[PDB]
Amino acid sequence: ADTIVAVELDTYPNTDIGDPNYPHIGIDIKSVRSKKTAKWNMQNGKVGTAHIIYNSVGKRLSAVVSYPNGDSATVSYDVDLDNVLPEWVRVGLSASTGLYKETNTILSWSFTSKLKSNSTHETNALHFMFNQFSKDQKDLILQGDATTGTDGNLELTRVSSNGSPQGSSVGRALFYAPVHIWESSAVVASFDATFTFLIKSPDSHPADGIAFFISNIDSSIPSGSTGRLLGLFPDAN
Amino acid sequence: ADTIVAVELDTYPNTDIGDPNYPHIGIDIKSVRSKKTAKWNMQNGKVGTAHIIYNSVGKRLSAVVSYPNGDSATVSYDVDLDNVLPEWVRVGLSASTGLYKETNTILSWSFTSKLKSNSTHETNALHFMFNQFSKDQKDLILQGDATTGTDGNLELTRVSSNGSPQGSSVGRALFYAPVHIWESSAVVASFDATFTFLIKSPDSHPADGIAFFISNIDSSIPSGSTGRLLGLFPDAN
Amino acid sequence: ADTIVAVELDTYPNTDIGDPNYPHIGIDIKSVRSKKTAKWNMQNGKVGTAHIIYNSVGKRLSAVVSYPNGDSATVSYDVDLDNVLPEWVRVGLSASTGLYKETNTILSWSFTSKLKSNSTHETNALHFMFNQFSKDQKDLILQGDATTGTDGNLELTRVSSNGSPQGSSVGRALFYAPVHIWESSAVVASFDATFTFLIKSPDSHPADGIAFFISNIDSSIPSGSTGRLLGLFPDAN
Amino acid sequence: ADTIVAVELDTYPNTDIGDPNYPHIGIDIKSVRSKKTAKWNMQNGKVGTAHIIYNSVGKRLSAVVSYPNGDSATVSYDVDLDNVLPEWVRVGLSASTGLYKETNTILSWSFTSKLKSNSTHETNALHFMFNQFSKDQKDLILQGDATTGTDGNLELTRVSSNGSPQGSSVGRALFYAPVHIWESSAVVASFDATFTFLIKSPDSHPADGIAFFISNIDSSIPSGSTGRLLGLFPDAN
Ligand SMILES: [Ca+2]
Ligand SMILES: [Ca+2]
Ligand SMILES: [Ca+2]
Ligand SMILES: [Ca+2]
Ligand SMILES: [Mn+2]
Ligand SMILES: [Mn+2]
Ligand SMILES: [Mn+2]
Ligand SMILES: [Mn+2]
């Protein structure tokens, strides 16, 4: 199926599938069942920022999500991505709502990838940065309910004309170009991403989350992957 | 018909179609007959560097080609590219051989695009850098004879395994993601590109050159644009 | 004395010294008497952004100042900076108030410098970006009334504890490291800066302006250079 | 006493002071006795590349040294640098020779620091890149025997004009601007550095190595830290 590495901003505790019982940031290596989570004090209606960093020297995938107020949640996991992901991938943002819902608004998203082979100055790099998203954002593949342009933002999941989030929605945006994430003869593979999000819900509890992910290039939304599956996984195995 | 903006490193004078009677650098606005040229002393078998720069504020497209010994040619052209290019483009390198030939070897290629909309820190950006090209370079669209991987280089045109370039070859490499080159709502759009090239004619009678170009996203090698048309234009109008 | 190249955001028309009779953006080459101005619809109390770009291929210094609302003023001037500035310089922000006053608040400031010599990949570069300024900003030399830290901003000129700007104030912030702006054997010298500013005045008219400047390294505020002189020039010659 | 964080490319085993009995790479936290080393097969007379990376999220300092043939050594150390370094530092390269010698030639050096405070797009950044060092390199502080300009390189230690390195030489180059490496209010601090070096011993008995270091801003070469102390430490404690 798809090969997924993701950092999830999981807004809803599905302890049924191994979520801790609080909103959490998590590192997901080919399963929605995070290898590692940290409690995340999600702030309904605040703008937050997630930073995801990997270096292939230290082989440690780290992520922080924070709110200006100051609250901040951190998670790291040792993983050799050489062993997990295909050589070439796509990188994206995914979000979902289920029975409970939230806006999954991306205000900005940036990504830098570096790939060095041994041979002096031999870095390849990709960087993109979106601070504004237009109606027709041709460097993004939008999947599912993802739209761009409304207030210059990427709405990952359905929002009504009056800003009201809809449930059972899933959507993703992938950067258009494949990303070379490792090679046979790589000295340093390394990447980082940042995105700023606004998760707002009128419900008793927001759900389900936003994920930064890295997939096989031809990745698409697994069917049924709204709600707790986060646009990322066909099931909770 | 494609819409092409190019900077050509034109190694062969086709005075026939308006070339000056020497190797030149030129800025091509929708025609192989450059709007502006400068004399260029192509150094056969040496690694050269071309830098292309444009910002939407000064509305000047500028290019330099230089070699390590310090010899360099420069050309600029005042042009408002919103009047020329679609809002969304691909960027690429193109090369051809005709009756005469040369290696059109790209050793590295990088590009930066920035687009700022009205709205305060509101920059979108694309950057990529290839200092090494792999046999399977999925973030490049390879067209015609273009191959990558051969010594970690991009050979835009056909070169036999002994290192000998072939006549009537065209090839191009376009970056995979479309590039947002302008918008209505744009305070600043700007881009710059650099590539290093090894043009070598074992005759020391080189043809036809290399171009950095910007095209409509669906651009392909026009029919019969080997030789002097540099993989860019259907004819010499 | 000092060698100054500046882009001025001149908020006050001193037609006595050659200002056009409206707020204006201007390019100043060793004189406060701009070589080139454009009318600038200054918006008292709005956050604006100025972008300054130079490439040494095109030898055209350009600047745009804009407000999110959408208003935007542009100016360019052909100048070989090789001939104006010393090889090594400092880059800074300057502002002043006089009889009339305004806050000269910098919210952010970034700068990129590139210097290539002929010799393939041989780029030197400096980039810095400040989105927040702390109390003790050791990579900035603060001159005159310039302070950092109050709300994470750089206040270039005196503001009272309640946010009220003071007249006859001058201040500057220079990036700490000297910048190599040209060399003998430079293929491309090129730089750009961005800053976002908030100019607010309670007076009948704001004054006097903010300038992005490039100076000799040992540059200091010319005495008496409050008001129309903008922290930049000892006189209006 | 200076506060030093270093990554050493240590070419000479002083088993005396805890070095392993082979050339190694190591992470030095306030002591020349590395907290972590990895075997390093220094290739005499070849141009190597060292990459150093740290982010404050994963809290792992990682380094690789490699040569073009693909041989590479890697070392990581879990460290929270806020516990080690002052908030404001300088970064630099250091080298020494002692009884044994080697060229400590730096062909290029680059560094990127990012510091994000609580506050939403709130990143401060410093980047510099030297691919060519000039005789008068005003953005470097040169200490001890360090000179620049000689072949566009930085010779950290004394080399005679025939190309022959000298014993008991120390030198360093610190980037001129202080670097904000952490703050209380910091969501993410991270940095990475790269330098390429040519260590050559015309005996093929090299000493003593090169280090990338981060120090208190006022750091100078400690007394008698030629040889094994690498210009970094006053003694071998
Ligand atoms: Ca969940
Ligand atoms: Ca031609
Ligand atoms: Ca004025
Ligand atoms: Ca040693
Ligand atoms: Mn979860
Ligand atoms: Mn031509
Ligand atoms: Mn003026
Ligand atoms: Mn050691």
Exposure string for C54-73, b = 16+ CB within 10 A, e = fewer = bbbbbbbbbbbbbbbeeebb
Return the residue matching tokens 């993989």: B231
Alpha-carbon distances of C172 from B179, C7, C160, rounded to whole Å: 38, 14, 17
Amino acid (1-letter code) at residue B18 = G
Inter-chain contact B62–C61, Cβ cutoff 8 Å?
no
SS3 D25: strand
CA distance linking residue D206 with residue D201, whole number of Å: 5
The 8 Å CB, 24+ separation contacts for D163-167 are D163/D103, D163/D202, D164/D202, D165/D97, D165/D101, D165/D102, D165/D103, D165/D104, D165/D200, D165/D201, D165/D202, D166/D97, D166/D101, D167/D97, D167/D98, D167/D99, D167/D100, D167/D101
Could you list the beta-strand ranges (E) of C154-236. 154-155, 170-175, 179-180, 186-198, 209-215
Under DSSP, the state recorded for C165 is B
The phi and psi torsions of A46 (rounded to 5 degrees) equal -95, 150
Which residues does residue A166 pair with via DSSP β-bridges, in sequence order? none
Return the residue matching tokens 């070096």: D197
CA distance linking residue C222 with residue C205, whole number of Å: 25
Q: Of the candidates D237, D177, D233, D175, which has an alpha carbon nearest to the alpha carbon of residue D209?
A: D233
C208: preceding bond cis by omega (within 30 degrees): yes
Q: Which chains touch A (3 or more CB pairs under 8 A)?
A: B, D
Which residues does residue D66 pair with via DSSP β-bridges, in sequence order? D49, D72
SS3 D131: coil
Could you list the beta-strand ranges (E) of chain D. 4-10, 24-29, 36-39, 47-55, 60-66, 72-78, 88-96, 103-117, 123-130, 140-144, 147-148, 154-155, 170-175, 179-180, 186-200, 209-216
Under DSSP, the state recorded for C128 is E
CA distance linking residue D73 with residue D78, whole number of Å: 17
**Cβ-based neighbour number of residue D166 at 10 Å:** 13
Q: What dihedral do alpha carbons C175, C87, D170, D17 form, nearest 10°?
A: 40
| Residues in chain B, total | 237
The phi and psi torsions of D83 (rounded to 5 degrees) equal -85, -10
Per the structure, the complete domain to which residue B43 belongs is given by 1-237
CA distance linking residue A111 with residue A130, whole number of Å: 9
SS3 D10: strand
**Cβ-based neighbour number of residue B209 at 10 Å:** 28
SS3 C73: strand
Measure CA of the first residue to CA of the last residue in chain B; give whole Å. 12
CA distance linking residue B228 with residue B235, whole number of Å: 9
Return the residue matching tokens 């100016």: C75
Inter-chain contact D58–A58, Cβ cutoff 8 Å?
yes
Shortest alpha-carbon distance between residue C162 and chain B (Å): 25
> Which of A87, A131, A215 to substitute to test the interface with B, most B CBs within 10 Å?
A131
Shortest alpha-carbon distance between residue A222 and chain D (Å): 31
CA distance linking residue D138 with residue C182, whole number of Å: 13
| Residues in chain C, total | 237
CATH of the domain at B118: 2.60.120.200
The phi and psi torsions of A172 (rounded to 5 degrees) equal -145, 160
Burial of A46 (0-12, 13-18, 19+ CB in 10 A): middle
> Which of C40, C60, C107, C123 to substitute to test the interface with B, most B CBs within 10 Å?
C60
Residues C207/C99, Cβ–Cβ less than 8 Å: yes
Q: Of the candidates D207, D215, D209, which has an alpha carbon nearest to the alpha carbon of residue D98?
A: D207
Token pair recorded at residue C207: 């004054």
Token pair recorded at residue A234: 């066909």
Residue B167 makes CB contacts below 8 A (sequence gap 6+) with B97, B98, B99, B100, B101
Residues B152/A119, Cβ–Cβ less than 8 Å: yes
Q: Which chains touch B (3 or more CB pairs under 8 A)?
A: A, C
Measure CA of the first residue to CA of the last residue in chain A; give whole Å. 13
Residues C220/C160, Cβ–Cβ less than 8 Å: no
The phi and psi torsions of C70 (rounded to 5 degrees) equal 145, -15
Under DSSP, the state recorded for D81 is G
Q: What dihedral do alpha carbons B222, B227, B230, B232 form, nearest 10°?
A: -20
Exposure string for A199-213, b = 16+ CB within 10 A, e = fewer = bbbeeeebbbbbbbb
CA distance linking residue A78 with residue A58, whole number of Å: 8
CA distance linking residue B89 with residue B218, whole number of Å: 8
- D221 alpha carbon to ligand 4 midpoint, in Å? 17
For C177, the enclosing helix (H) or strand (E) is none
CA distance linking residue D45 with residue D202, whole number of Å: 8
Q: What dihedral do alpha carbons B12, B17, B20, B21 form, nearest 10°?
A: 60
Chain B residues at the A interface, defined by Cβ less than 8 Å, are: 88, 117, 119, 121-132, 134, 136, 138-139, 152, 175-180, 183, 217
Technique used by the depositors: X-ray
CA distance linking residue C194 with residue C181, whole number of Å: 17
Inter-chain contact B120–C196, Cβ cutoff 8 Å?
yes
Which residue among D72, D76, D118 places its CB closest to the CB of A187? Answer: D72
Question: Looking at the CA of A24, which ligand is closest?
Answer: 5
**Cβ-based neighbour number of residue D179 at 10 Å:** 23
User: CA-based Rg of chain D, rounded to a whole angstrom?
Assistant: 17
Residues B156/B104, Cβ–Cβ less than 8 Å: yes
Alpha-carbon distances of D205 from C122, D93, D159, D231, rounded to whole Å: 31, 22, 15, 19
Exposure string for C138-152, b = 16+ CB within 10 A, e = fewer = bbbbbbbbbbbeeeb
Under DSSP, the state recorded for C187 is E
Q: Of the candidates A214, A142, A204, A197, which has an alpha carbon nearest to the alpha carbon of residue A167?
A: A204
Inter-chain contact A70–D118, Cβ cutoff 8 Å?
yes
CA distance linking residue D32 with residue B72, whole number of Å: 48
Which residue among D119, D127, D176 places its CB closest to the CB of C152? Answer: D119
CA distance linking residue A74 with residue C191, whole number of Å: 37
Shortest alpha-carbon distance between residue C50 and chain B (Å): 10
Strands C147-148 and C154-155: antiparallel
> Which of D107, D187, D190, D194 to substitute to test the interface with A, most A CBs within 10 Å?
D187
Alpha-carbon distances of A200 from A9, A102, C108, rounded to whole Å: 13, 5, 28
- D91 alpha carbon to ligand 4 midpoint, in Å? 21
CA distance linking residue D108 with residue D137, whole number of Å: 13
Domain count, chain C: 1
Inter-chain contact A122–B136, Cβ cutoff 8 Å?
no
For D161, the enclosing helix (H) or strand (E) is none
Residues D196/D49, Cβ–Cβ less than 8 Å: yes
Burial of C222 (0-12, 13-18, 19+ CB in 10 A): middle
Experimental structure resolution, Å? 2.3
Amino acid (1-letter code) at residue B217 = I
Q: Which chains touch D (3 or more CB pairs under 8 A)?
A: A, C
Strands D88-96 and D72-78: unpaired
Amino acid (1-letter code) at residue A48 = G
CA distance linking residue B188 with residue B82, whole number of Å: 12
Return the residue matching tokens 């950044």: D125
Amino acid (1-letter code) at residue A216 = N
CA distance linking residue C173 with residue C154, whole number of Å: 8
For C64, the enclosing helix (H) or strand (E) is strand C60-66
**Cβ-based neighbour number of residue B173 at 10 Å:** 28
**Cβ-based neighbour number of residue B151 at 10 Å:** 11
CA distance linking residue A92 with residue A52, whole number of Å: 12
Q: H/E/C letters for each residue in chain A?
A: CCCEEEEEEECCCCHHHCCCCCCEEEEEECCCCCCEEEECCCCCCCEEEEEEEEECCCCEEEEEEECCCCCEEEEEEECCHHHCCCCEEEEEEEEECCCCCCCCEEEEEEEEEEEEECCCCCEEEEEEEECCCCCCCCCEEEEECCEECHHHCEECCCECCCCCECCCCEEEEEECCCEECCCCCEEEEEEEEEEEEECCCCCCCCCCEEEEEEECCCCCCCCCCCHHHCCCCCCCC
| Residue-wise DSSP of chain B | ---EEEEEEE-S--GGGT--SS-EEEEEESSSS-SEEEE----TT-EEEEEEEEETTTTEEEEEEE-TTS-EEEEEEE--GGGTS-SEEEEEEEEE-SSS--EEEEEEEEEEEEEEESSSS-EEEEEEEESS--SS-TTEEEEET-EE-GGG-EESS-B-TTS-B-SS-EEEEEESS-EE---TTEEEEEEEEEEEEEEE-TTS----EEEEEEEETT----TT--GGGTTT-SS--
Inter-chain contact B126–A139, Cβ cutoff 8 Å?
yes
Token pair recorded at residue B79: 């042009």
Which residue among D70, D76, D121 places its CB closest to the CB of A108? Answer: D121
Residues C58/B58, Cβ–Cβ less than 8 Å: yes
Chain D residues at the A interface, defined by Cβ less than 8 Å, are: 47, 49, 51, 53, 55, 57-64, 66-72, 74, 76, 108, 116, 118-122, 131, 185, 187-188, 190, 192, 196
Alpha-carbon distances of D171 from D128, D196, D211, rounded to whole Å: 20, 17, 11
Residues A177/A52, Cβ–Cβ less than 8 Å: no
Residue C218 annotated as binding? no
User: CA-based Rg of chain B, rounded to a whole angstrom?
Assistant: 17
User: CA-based Rg of chain C, rounded to a whole angstrom?
Assistant: 17
> Which of B49, B126, B216 to substitute to test the interface with A, most A CBs within 10 Å?
B126
Alpha-carbon distances of A148 from A51, A104, A105, A152, B46, rounded to whole Å: 21, 12, 10, 7, 47
**Cβ-based neighbour number of residue C15 at 10 Å:** 9
Shortest alpha-carbon distance between residue B129 and chain C (Å): 12
For D40, the enclosing helix (H) or strand (E) is none
Residue A30 makes CB contacts below 8 A (sequence gap 6+) with A3, A4, A5, A84
Which residues does residue D19 pair with via DSSP β-bridges, in sequence order? none
| Interface contacts A/B by beta carbons within 8 Å | 77
Return the residue matching tokens 């000295």: A187
Token pair recorded at residue B204: 């020391």
Residue B92 makes CB contacts below 8 A (sequence gap 6+) with B141, B172, B173, B174, B175, B212, B213, B214, B215, B219
CA distance linking residue D228 with residue C128, whole number of Å: 35
**Cβ-based neighbour number of residue A237 at 10 Å:** 9
| Residue-wise DSSP of D172-237 | EEEESS-EE---TTEEEEEEEEEEEEEEE-TTS----EEEEEEEETT----TT--GGGTTT-SS--
Which residue among A120, A131, A187 places its CB closest to the CB of D64? Answer: A187
Residue D18 makes CB contacts below 8 A (sequence gap 6+) with D33, D34, D236
CA B236 to chain centre: 17
User: CA-based Rg of chain A, rounded to a whole angstrom?
Assistant: 17
By the CB criterion, residues less than 5 angstroms from ion ligand 2 are B 10, 12, 14, 19, 228
